[model samples]
Target: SGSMILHAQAKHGKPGLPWLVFLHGFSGDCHEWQEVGEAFADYSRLYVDLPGHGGSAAISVDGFDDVTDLLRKTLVSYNILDFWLVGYSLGGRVAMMAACQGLAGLCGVIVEGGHPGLQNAEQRAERQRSDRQWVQRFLTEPLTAVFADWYQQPVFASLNDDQRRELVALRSNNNGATLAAMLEATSLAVQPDLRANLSARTFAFYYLCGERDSKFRALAAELAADCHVIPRAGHNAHRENPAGVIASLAQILRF
Candidate 1:
């Protein structure tokens, strides 16, 4: 268990107040939540660099449980004793599983574009195949070349040409080999089916989505929890519309 914990940095300098611990999307670092936490100066915030990105770029894990475990351990390193998890995409999925572990001080989980693991065997196979293709590309091709196509996926349909280009450029700084390793390790194919797992929990499980992200909107509809739509945004709502993100957080946190 001595393996390195995921990296994190505390911000807002308000340790006495409740904390908002944020997790970014795949291939993204703590900067992913840059603007989203700006308005919440009343509460402390922690931005995490999940394995294979940013400060944790050199860290690798064996599987999903390892990531959740590492993250829980990472939280223990900080002074935070009460917090809500606002995780996006890959970070969201991990947040869901980690929440199930009942980690003390976890107030709630707010997922943005996070998938409740694959429930179907065949469906999961397809995800593995798709994820495998990308991991291979990340390993063999240049990051820019791979990301050009990466941003073209249907899920990112909400992105304009310039936005896509911006992401490709920003994400290119990631270590390709490390990214590939984390991608394969945390593949949705290997992820668990959370249809029942998440529903069974009475704890807060608010789903935040971009008004433009039809897919996740549909997924949110199927869940039993509350859903908040970020106006004029896409899959990456925190970056696209931090105002909406903050609004939803303020509404749900009820402080």
Candidate 2:
């Protein structure tokens, strides 16, 4: 709506209800949370396609701040004063970054499988180098091939052949250049490590990881975070085992 444009879907709810904002992961669009959004239909809902994905793919951004600013504006435009932020994977990173920015009327943040960034220079440098290679592959290789290699990592080991194929097909709709640029801009190397931030958090902060997603599950424990694990799911718990994710949220939020 400002210098950059983002595609969004908003659903009105009862006046006293909270606003629930959903942000999807990288290579994903607003559709990622459609079913989840419907599950929370009692609350006002807003879902946005992050820059470089879905309808917002053509909208260029400089870095993570650009993503949060657009989100801030979208909320302001809709007159949503109090809201809960929910994000998964890359979107969870964005949500955490936005939380650190101290937005007004933020109820809390619920991050699923989010990275808090590298804590030291060595880790940052290594991650930067790896992300650079990925950026290049995303720019030049066939989308299918790139995704095939991307999901082969240990973190995504739980994804079956069909799930991987579906993700690759979904990601194929994105423009390679746009995805590359976005990857370079928001790579973990450049993001600030938010462990200390969470440790001294002023607002409520919650972490969610699938029981099978051991990496993040360990991270959540390491952070001493208020965490919950979704059973029978992996990295993409919301997609793989939505009912479990929903049940956990309902318990935590008392909805």
Candidate 3:
């Protein structure tokens, strides 16, 4: 309600069952997970667009902690106690933060293409500068211009013309100021190393990404060696191979 925007897909098989919350990356919205949500339509699902990305358009702070505070409050406001978390890109950072808090209600975590943290200060600074540049561009450039530059990231190369068009449309439609603030507040450099944090937790953990998206799938493999990798996918794994991703998720549902 304050700084985050959310879309809830409440039409799961059972009305009042434990649900799954979907979080999209920076410059993305609840609809980013539509295909995956549809695949799991029989299971309870909720997709939340973080503060600056979708219907939610407010910024109170310029740090990840504040943003995560807003996110936690929003979840509490909805009285959602039992749920699985599936976050991609930037959203994965938020999910990891929530996961680190060790809430008893957390059912499990499924992260699609995210990082634990940077390995060095130099890398962190570079990411910080890059995030700041994006924030400035969000204010100065046409949304298409900004996204055209963004889509070139090695992680996103798997998308075709149509899929790229869809991602562009979703991001360009966001409020400029809100998106800029989010970029600044949640830059990857500033996020914590959740690997150590999660080492002790017994939650079902999944490091998922597109097989073709070597950047993240490699990272995912390193993170979850025993976890299966989704084939024929890339950085935007959901958009590239929704069926494969969902089929893997279906196994989780059975348990």
- Tell me each candidate's TM-score: 0.94, 0.94, 0.88
Error of 3 at 35 (Å): 1.4
Q: How many steric clashes does model 2 contain?
A: 0
Candidate lDDT (C-alpha), each: 0.86, 0.85, 0.74
How would you encode candidate 3's per-residue C-alpha lDDT over 98-163 as one tens digit per residue? 787655578888888778777778998999898888889998888888898788776566557787
- Candidate 2 residues 216-238, lDDT tens each? 98888878985788888788888
Model 1: pairs clashing at backbone N, Cα or C within 3 Å = none
TM accuracy, model 1: 0.94
What are the RMSDs of all candidates, in order? 1.7, 1.7, 2.5
Positional deviation of 198 in candidate 2, in angstroms?
1.3
Best by lDDT: 1
Shift of residue 133 alpha carbon in model 1, Å = 0.8
Structure candidate 3, residue pairs in collision: 3-51, 4-51, 210-233
Per-prediction tally of clashes: 0, 0, 3
Better of 1 and 3 by TM-score: 1
